Amino acid sequence: VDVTRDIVSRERVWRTRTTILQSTGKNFSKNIFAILQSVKARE
Amino acid sequence: GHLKKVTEQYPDDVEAWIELAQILEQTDIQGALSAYGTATRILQEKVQADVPPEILNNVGALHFRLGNLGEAKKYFLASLDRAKAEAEHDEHYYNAISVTTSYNLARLYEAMCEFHEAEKLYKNILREHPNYVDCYLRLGAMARDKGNFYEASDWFKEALQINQDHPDAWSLIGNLHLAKQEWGPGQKKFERILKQPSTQSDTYSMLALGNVWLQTLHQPTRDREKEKRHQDRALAIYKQVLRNDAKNLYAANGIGAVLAHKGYFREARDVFAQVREATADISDVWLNLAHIYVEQKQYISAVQMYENCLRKFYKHQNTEVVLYLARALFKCGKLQECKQTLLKARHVAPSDTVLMFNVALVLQRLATSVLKDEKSNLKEVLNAVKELELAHRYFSYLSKVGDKMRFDLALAATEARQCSDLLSQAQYHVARARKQDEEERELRA
Amino acid sequence: YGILFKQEQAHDDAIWSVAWGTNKKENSETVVTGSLDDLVKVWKWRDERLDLQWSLEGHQLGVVSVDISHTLPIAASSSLDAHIRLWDLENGKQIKSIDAGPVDAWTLAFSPDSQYLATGTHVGKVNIFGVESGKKEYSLDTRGKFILSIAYSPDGKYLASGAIDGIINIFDIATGKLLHTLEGHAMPIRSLTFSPDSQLLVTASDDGYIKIYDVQHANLAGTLSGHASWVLNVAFCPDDTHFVSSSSDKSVKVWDVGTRTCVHTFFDHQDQVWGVKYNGNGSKIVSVGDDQEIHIYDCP
Incomplete structure (x- = not known):
């Protein structure tokens, strides 16, 4: 039916699952994978 | 930046604040709320035209995330009334506007500790548009609250059957098995169904x-x-x-x-x-x-x-x-x-x-x-x-x-x-x- | 509709139950409260003020349930210590200590005749002890998980039991036999009480839904959407016009037994309210909770 495309075409979804997953800020892996590799190196 | 430019000057701005809010929805909710507030009153000077239901619906939705649950409810009710008043707005589909307004209102009532009314409104949506997914899923969540083996577990799987390409429905199916972890190693299969590259x-x-x-x-x-x-x-x-x-x-x-x-x-x-x-x-x-x-x-x-x-x-x-x-x-x-x-x-x-x-x-x-x-x-x-x-x-x-x-x-x-x-x-x-x-x-x- | 009295720091420790009388047998004027501080405080609600009358001790563990005999001015208090101790409000002295060992002791249930005392059992049965005997008279052979709530009908015709999995067991105190097993809930039933007319049965499950069933034909009279947290305690207005609900969200909702509508709500408790009870007339509603403050709510 047309109702589906009628609604989905005008609505807006600001947040979804992945949006929840990522932090709102800027937290890159540079400060993380560094330790992730250091620990392995010691092992 | 363009909105900032237009805001200062007042070249008889009418819809600039609409755009301001439309962008600010993702950002601070209050900026959008203020934009809608000023826009509501800017639509009554040129003529005596009732505010279109969409704007009131959107501001009520903004409030819905907030503690102004009653205020958002009043907004949603007024939006429904106005949309019903749109008898000749078939091209804009006042019907879809009312549908989304009622969906939001049912969500609010489910959040307002009134599951009876939430169920009733979601069912009013269902009876008129069974091809809709979200309400069919929220009813399942409501029935899940009492227990995980009730009509929740059935409504979720039915929603998936009617739309297997819906990540939310399939994830919910994945969630069902979480209540009982006896499917520890076996839940890998049902959690890999939609790992196809198209979904990836x-x-x-x-x-x-x-x-x-x-x-x-x-x-x-x-x-x-x-x-x-x-x-x-x-x-x-x-x-x-x-x-x-x-x-x-x-x-x-x-x-x-x-x-x-x-x-x-x-x-x-x-x-x-x-x-x-x-x-x-x-x-x-x-x-x-x-x-x-x-x-x-x-x-x-x-x-x-x-x-x-x-x-x-x-x-x-x-x-x-x-x-x-x-x-x-x-x-x-x-x-x-x-x-x-x-x-x-x-x-x-x-x-x-x-x-x-x-x-x-x-x-x-x-x-x-x-x-x-x-x-x-x-x-x-x-x-x-x-x-x-x-x-x-x-x-x-x-x-x-x-x-x-x-x-x-x-x-x-x-x-x-x-x-x-x-x-x-x-x-x-x-x-x-x-x-x-x-x-x-x-x-x- | 408001709050009359506000007892601050009613106990050292959180209060989990409250008992107030309804008859004229020197009970409606005295409020018996059981808290985790092992303090059975017999408060005399005299002069429209909550004044302490006795302070009974002896329970090794915190008080779990408190209730006043309908046809008698004495009271009793249980705890998880497996030592249900009977007390007299007339003198503030202990009558006896039923050692419901080793651990089998749960909330109390005064019979309307004030002759029998029902107690839940970990084995899932409901033991019925004698008030004046203290020995296990007869136990209801309805096993399962555990008895979480037991209530006596005001006129003593039926008796319902709330299990850990939303299983209502309708026994017959007139013959000590299981009549109905209403299973409209899957959540642990916290507490329940009989209507003043012994016609409706309210269930306080952990789903926030007040499903009021019928006892005469064991059918659901309607699903009522309560609070957001778990409904802990529930009581009927003695005139049988409304019923208060105590939940785990600092909310005291007075729902209408007839219309299933919230006639009023209180938010004066900073913590969760554990116990709510009416007065002998239904105007005053005493309330306890983790806040350790007794609030008397007036609803003319």
Whole structure:
């Protein structure tokens, strides 16, 4: 039916699952994978 | 920038604020609310034209995320009225506007502690548009609240059948199996159905796999080179999701978890540092950070976290939180108050054996702490014997129970011998209590 | 509709139950409260003020339930200590101590005749002890998980039991036999009470839904959407016009038994309210909770 495309075409979804997953800020892996590799190196 | 430019000047602006809000929805909700507020009043000077229902619906939606639940409800009702007034707006489909307005209103009522009205409104949507998904799923969630085997489990699968290409529905199907973890290894298949490249990349399902693979941890079979491989597989999943997304907090969370399991608590704090700094308002981070603290002989820094996690309006006495609360407590305030919280927990559900065992253990700890090296107040010696007797009765009772905490409690015999020699010591120290009594007596004389 | 009295720091420890009388047998004027501080405080609600009258002790563990005999001015208090101790409000003295060992002791249930005392059992049965005997007279052979709530009908015709999994067991105190087993809930039933007319049965499950069923034909009379947290305690207005609900969200909702509508709500408790009870007329509604403050709510 047309109702589906009628609604989905005008609505807006600001947040979804992945949006929840990522932090709102800027937290890159540079400060993380560094330790992730250091620990392995010691092992 | 363009909106900023137009805002200052007033070239008879009518719709500029509409755009302002339309952009600000993702950003600070209040900016959009203010934009809508000013826009509402800018639409009555040129003519006496009733505000279109869409704007009022959108502002009510903004409020819905806020505490203005009643105000948002009034907005939604007015939007429904106005949309109904749109008899000649078939091209704009006033019907769809009313549909979304009612959907939002039902969501609010479900959030307003009125599930009857939420169900009624969702069913009013269903009767007129069965091809819709979200309401069919919210009804299932509402029925799930009472129980996971009720029409929730059926409505979710039916929603998937009518739309198998809906990630939300399939993830919900994946969630159904979470209530019963007996599908530990088997839930991999149902969680890999939609991992096809067309759906990829999907971080939600990948993190679900990482979790269900982490759940397998905490077993005594690690020495069999089995839990190590599981750790390695989970770590690899986390690394991949980290590479493809460096801003996903949950990957870092799971990495910190596995490192703690690897024994790097001194190093677990650093990794959990970033996740906490991003957003500490997630149940898991509190508990993991408390785990690290309590591991370092810091109950001072752990009990507060456990309390804060319990500050949420979901429960008051959770069993797991208290179980993690009493780890190495030996101080006066961490034994008697530990008993208080233990009773609080067992109050909601006494059926657990672990509570009945920890209570007796702390009872014995206190009894020996006052009946071995004391030589303390007398009335305490009077109460210690009653406490030890109750601990002994519980020791007798706990032995007859079949199932245990995945570990048989046949090791209560040492507890019985401890209680026996404690009884002997108490019968010995009551004499000391009497001597102290006669001492204070001759003193006052 | 408001709050009359506000007792601050009513106890050292959190209060989990409250008992107030309804008859004229020197009970409606005295409020008996059981808290985790092992303090059975017999408050005399005299001069429209809550004044302490007795302070009974002896329970090793915190008080779990408190209730006043309908046809008698004495009371009793239980705890998880397996030592249900009877008390007399006339003198503030202990009558006896039923040692419901080793651990088998749960909330109390005064019979309307004030002759029998029902107690839940970990084995899932409901033991019926004698008030003047203290020995196990007869136990209801309806096993399962555990008895979480027991209530006596005001006229003593039926008796319902709330299990850990939303299983209502309708027994017959007239013959001590299980009549109906209403299973409209899957959540642990916290507490329940009979309507003043012994016609409706309210269930306080952990789903936030007040499903009021019918006892005569064991049917659901309607699903009512309560609070957001778990409904802890529930009581009927003695005139049988409304019923208060105590939940785990600092909310005291007075729902209408007839219209299933919230006639009023109180938010004066900073913590969760554990106990709510009416007055002998239904105007005053005493309330307890983790806040350790007794709030008397006046609803003329």
